[PDB]
Symmetry: C2
Subunit: 793 residues, 2 copies
């Protein structure tokens, strides 16, 4: 039948998994100190070559750590699941939090006193030499003022690195780091030196070669440590394993991989070393089943058991990565999350189905390991085999939140509309949460900013004011609107004003990374950086984008529709009472009963998510106004802005920035997640809700849309549960929604994990486009997830 | 045709003598303030950091008005002294703390207090200079070639760029306030629909901040004038200081309303540019054109006072000084900053541009008689006879000035490089001999020195320099079947070393763009404001890079000596010549066949005697350099173009060249510019001029330099002047670009050598500029003494 169940992992895998779950996250100092010394030593160099010296010093000198039982080795931090510090982007919040980071609510980390003193010393170098400090210098005062008041934020790449990329893993698997050096050497040989342009290109080429020579050394340093351990090792079986690891790391990634186990080690070295060079998250394995499977197929000696165990170790290694952020940013990316998205299935470049045996081993690994990472995903298209969808649904039914599901049939045309070739778009993977790209061909900036559309609505209805600040243009007081035409004219003018500032802030950060932190190790693994002689930060990628995310879509749509119906059409209240009610927070604090009555009238208007065309098209319209403004703009890499709609863990945080709204929500309350209907307001079941969500224009939001559903576990039980569950996905994708993902959990389970967190350390559930340990999320985020609508067939 | 010259006021003489008697110091204030501004502004884009640098200096540098001055503004507290600009380079300053006061070329005093102050500021700079970044962009082969003396880019490597004539006329008319208004309007009109506006707006904000501080700087001189006036016991001087205070309140914040104000506008621009950056050759250019409207409109001023103000400007120009590292100072010797000022020529409509201020500028040179300005005249087909003959009277004073430039070569030469006919007609001279369309050009007119005679050395040694493989293996000279083989080999060596020359220049170019774009200077050249980009990033309408050839006559006479003595007349073999060159013609060994070979080579026909065969070899060797250079471009979207001029370095770089086939011994001086070799033009000045004009001057559009030296007897009287003007017209009609003249007796120079204390005021041409003879190193003095003395 359709239900096959899941196998169990080896005991070794269970021990490696538990080592992650029991690890206390620390902040560590060695990479930050080494990086700092590389900067001090190399003031005179062009940035790209300074950055080669940075990775050279780190790769040569960072501590090398092999953990008990690992088959796949490489550690960013001495301690499991800990974080380096990357002061080149920002530092001052680390020192401000030396004594509070261990106790903050979202993502605490231990900072021992010696580590604090070491970081204090290194940070003396940094004032005004970070990328952030330069980015801020480029921004206008109005742009900064809008961000200060919570219209939008570019914190992600302002305080940290970029990342958000799926590199050419298959190229390194084939030709190795030595092959990269060879390609660069040939580019040097063939350089046109007849003008001045060759000088900087040769700097880049030499920086890449130096970086990859050092990257070879790094792998050999792990081979050397594996051999030292083998010579002390007492169990002859573990000795043989350590000897094989030393052999693997001698071969890869310097040279192409010759076994599946070597291929896994090539993969993990690339995965970890990128996040050593830079703190940018969303380093996404992408189509792991596609580029890894030739190395499994050609390995005639490996058993299916050992091959699965290796994939399991990879899943577990992916959970060893961690990242601290400033105390507020950490609330927006909560759960010790670095968003390594790994997808399976879909189509080949020729448009044939891409399922292979490793596709299903990746699903098994998720069932074996059951940890937050990777952010595991499936691609779905019209020829997806029934067995692949049903197997994925059977995995979703375990309640980990994974796999998220992505619709080829929308994403491919969406990418084509942005200039991506049909051949490249067929090969897409997902970056981070929900963001599609042609892998190893894109500098996508897929989480460049968070933009609060509900805040823009607030400000529109207050004639451009926020508090006692004139923040936007004076588009008119809401009491002067003659009808919905007037509102929309004013909203578009506020949107144009604030989106222009959003683009300024993004491009300022973009310029700052180009001037100060171009990356010679990462850049060599993305087309066409080598061919062009330019880093990713300078536009070397074939495709260039910048992706800012809308917050409050359903909140804005339902509020605008409430004005349409309750004021203009049915005349239940006047524009003047609405203004007074909004200013008084519906009388939350004064107890005004007319405002409370008005709140009740507004709350009971039709809402997005019940398959009601009227109100659904207002949500579509409000989202379109944002998406249509964003796409008018370009970045300094010659690329195009494109909107996304996803919340990571910040729809609570950014709700705190918005006063009362015309749909009846009180000041500072949470916003809706992604394109999902407002929490608890879709009450006609999952098909009706999916039908509403699919009415939005997903194609124009080509940085990715995010739709969350949550099911009662018993509704998915049995073969008929899988049948219905698969039919729901096909329905939604046939109606041109881009993405959907599922929690499958009982309300009491979430409540119990709140009351007795020490017994629920392994409870992993979906937040938004990624999964996390429920108990490490702040209570207000836990409560928001609990408040989500419970679906049932 | 002889009027004589008037005498300056006693004030002008006192001011002039202050310059002669001044002992040059190194000073620390500007360097310390600059450093603090960098430290305080790490986070800014470079252009804004550079605005913060000039804002701190303009706000805080000591304000110094000197006794008797009518025109005020001091770069240094002490007269004739130098600031330090560590943003370009610093380590040689501190290396020389104890030796700079005693070095042979251009000593400066460094008091202990000053060295301590500089020692502390220098702690900031390791690896943060433009030079340290420029070196990092260069290939090892390029640095190796420079280490072995093939060429050097030291000028803009160790120091600022400069080499520009800014829009003085625009500031005279609209002031700094008008610059700010133009930028405010560019900001208003900015297209903000893409990402390109972000950096443009940084540039605009940097410019506005710079010019707000520039206005404060002039007001600070107004305050000090007003303070000095309050303390002045002499009533006449009191009124002068009050009038100075009023001038400095008006200009250059606003446009000038009197001639005395216009003179104060000019000098504020001239001095403040060289506070922002140590780049020299900040050239007033066509002073008589843009200043004359302000003289004509000034109905109240007397002729004598207008003359005395022009004299005060001449003397202020001599207040500027610049230290360089001990070796670089030998190449720019004489406390020299090369501020070239020309008069006459044509208007942009092709009519003669002489006006009454033209002749007052000539009188100022006769009044003042100091090294600066580097005074020049333009000469065209319609030059009035009275202007040429007055210029020749001034030349007879033996100061070396005016240098003479030929519109009829320079304008089509600039046209060949894309300059519009309208812009080319408005050309001035930069520095020594380098022409440009003023306030329209970022020309880099002295970006490098390139030793063509060294390339010849290396060619004949199959790419070797002292058993070091510096160039390609084009073949040993003993395998040349004829001159065709030599020229093939020489062109291959030239292409190799000019590619490295261009790399080194462009590396310095990139470094200045990345780390030191200039928001004060840039606003005064088209089209930086309209484009929203600095000069360092290509804001100028016209962009060039200009490297200078050395050893042209040496190379031509050597190459011809092989042609005649080896191939044609078979008087020695290639093997003997190779042996004689390696052995320095037996200078140590006493080998008599090598001495006989040297005599044979020394007596070959030589460039400079109107002999076509040898002259065309000099032409061909110079073309090979100029034709290679112009194949290349710079990062500002502009074009390389060769010049030929030595400043004071033809002795210095002769030390890098071993024996040559023309018979010169190892390490001996090279020839200056396009001039014939020292003492080798023996048939007189018309013959020598006829030879020089056979070179292709048009392709050497960064400027050529031709020195002549006359016995004063041969220019005496009315007959002397007619002969002298006829010589100039002969040479320019035959399409030479430039000529200038020493007019001095041999014994005068020799006496200055033995009794320098009684000849501190002796001023003579070095090359493209004049200097106090007693300040030049003995070997430079001897080289000038050895130049051919001409006679009609």
């Amino acid at each position: 039948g359709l239900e096959k169940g899941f196998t169990h992992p080896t005991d070794r895998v269970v021990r490696l998994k538990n080592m992650i779950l029991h690890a206390k996250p620390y902040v560590e100092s060695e990479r930050a100190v080494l990086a700092t010394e590389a900067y001090k030593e190399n003031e005179q160099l062009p940035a790209i070559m300074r950055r080669a010296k940075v990775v050279e010093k780190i790769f040569n000198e960072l501590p090398v750590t092999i953990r008990p039982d690992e088959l796949i080795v490489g550690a960013v931090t001495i301690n499991p699941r800990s974080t380096e510090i990357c002061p080149e982007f920002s530092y001052d919040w680390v020192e401000k939090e030396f004594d509070t980071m261990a106790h903050r609510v979202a993502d605490p980390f231990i900072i021992e006193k010696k580590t604090a003193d070491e970081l204090h010393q290194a940070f003396k170098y940094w004032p005004g030499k970070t990328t952030s400090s330069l980015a801020a210098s480029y921004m206008s005062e109005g742009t900064k003022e809008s961000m200060s008041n919570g219209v939008f934020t570019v914190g992600n790449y302002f305080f940290g690195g970029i990342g958000h990329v799926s590199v050419d893993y298959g190229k390194v698997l084939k030709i190795g780091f030595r092959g990269i050096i060879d390609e660069v050497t040939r580019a040097l040989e063939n350089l046109d030196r007849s003008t001045s342009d060759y000088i900087k290109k040769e700097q880049f080429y030499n920086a890449v070669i130096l970086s990859y020579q050092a990257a070879i050394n790094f792998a050999h340093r792990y081979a050397q440590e594996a051999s030292r351990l083998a010579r002390e090792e007492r169990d002859p079986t573990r000795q043989r394993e350590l000897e094989q690891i030393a052999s693997n790391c001698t071969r890869v990634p310097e040279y192409g991989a010759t076994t599946f186990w070597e291929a896994c080690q090539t993969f993990w070295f690339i995965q970890s070393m990128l996040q050593i060079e830079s703190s940018g998250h969303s380093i996404s394995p992408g189509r792991f089943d596609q580029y890894m499977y030739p190395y499994l197929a050609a390995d005639t000696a490996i058993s299916s058991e050992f091959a699965q165990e290796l994939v399991d170790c990879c899943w577990i290694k992916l959970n060893d990565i961690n990242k601290t952020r400033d105390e507020i940013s950490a609330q927006a990316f909560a759960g010790y999350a670095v968003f390594q998205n790994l997808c399976v299935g879909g189509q080949t470049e020729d448009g044939r189905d891409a399922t292979n045996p490793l596709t299903y081993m990746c699903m098994e690994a998720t069932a074996h390991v059951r940890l937050p990472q990777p952010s595991f995903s499936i691609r779905v298209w019209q020829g997806t085999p029934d067995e692949f969808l049903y197997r994925a649904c059977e995995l979703v039914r375990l309640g980990l939140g994974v796999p998220a599901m992505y619709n080829d049939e929308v994403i491919i045309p969406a990418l084509q509309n942005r200039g991506v070739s049909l051949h490249d778009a067929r090969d897409y993977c997902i970056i981070g949460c929900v963001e599609p790209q042609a892998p190893h061909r894109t500098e996508g900036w897929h989480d460049a900013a968070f933009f609060n559309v509900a805040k823009v609505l607030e400000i529109t209805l207050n004639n451009g004011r926020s508090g006692n600040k004139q923040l936007g243009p004076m588009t008119g007081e809401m009491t002067q609107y003659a009808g919905m035409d007037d509102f929309y004219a004013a909203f578009k003018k506020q949107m144009a004003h604030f989106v222009h500032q959003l683009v300024e802030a993004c491009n300022s950060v973009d310029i700052a990374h180009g001037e100060r932190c171009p990356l010679p190790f990462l850049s060599a693994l993305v087309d066409d950086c080598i061919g062009r002689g330019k880093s990713l930060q300078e536009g070397g990628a074939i495709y260039n984008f910048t992706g800012p995310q809308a917050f409050g879509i359903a909140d804005t749509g339902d509020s605008v529709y409430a004005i349409q119906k309750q004021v203009f059409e049915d005349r239940r209240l006047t524009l003047q009472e609405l203004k007074g009610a909004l200013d008084a927070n519906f009388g939350y604090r004064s107890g005004n009963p007319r405002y409370e009555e008005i709140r009740h009238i507004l709350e009971n208007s039709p809402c997005f998510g019940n398959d009601i065309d009227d109100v659904d098209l207002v949500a579509r319209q409000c989202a379109l106004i944002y998406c249509q403004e964003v796409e008018k703009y370009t970045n300094p890499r010659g690329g195009r802005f494109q909107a996304g709609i996803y919340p990571v863990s910040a729809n609570v945080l950014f709700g705190k920035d918005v006063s009362a709204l015309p749909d009846g929500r009180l000041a500072k309350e949470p916003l809706a997640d992604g394109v999902s209907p407002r929490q608890g307001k879709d009450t006609l079941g999952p098909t009706a809700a999916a039908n509403s969500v699919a009415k939005l224009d997903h194609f124009i939001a080509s940085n990715g849309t995010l739709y969350n559903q949550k099911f009662l576990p018993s509704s998915l039980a049995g073969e008929k549960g899988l049948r219905n569950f698969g039919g729901l996905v096909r329905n939604y994708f046939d109606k041109k929604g881009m993405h959907v993902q599922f929690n499958v959990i009982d309300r009491n389970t979430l409540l119990e994990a709140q009351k007795n967190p020490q017994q629920h350390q392994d409870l992993v559930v979906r937040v938004a486009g990624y999964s996390a340990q429920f108990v490490v999320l702040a209570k207000e985020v836990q409560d928001d997830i609990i408040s989500r609508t419970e679906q049932q067939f």
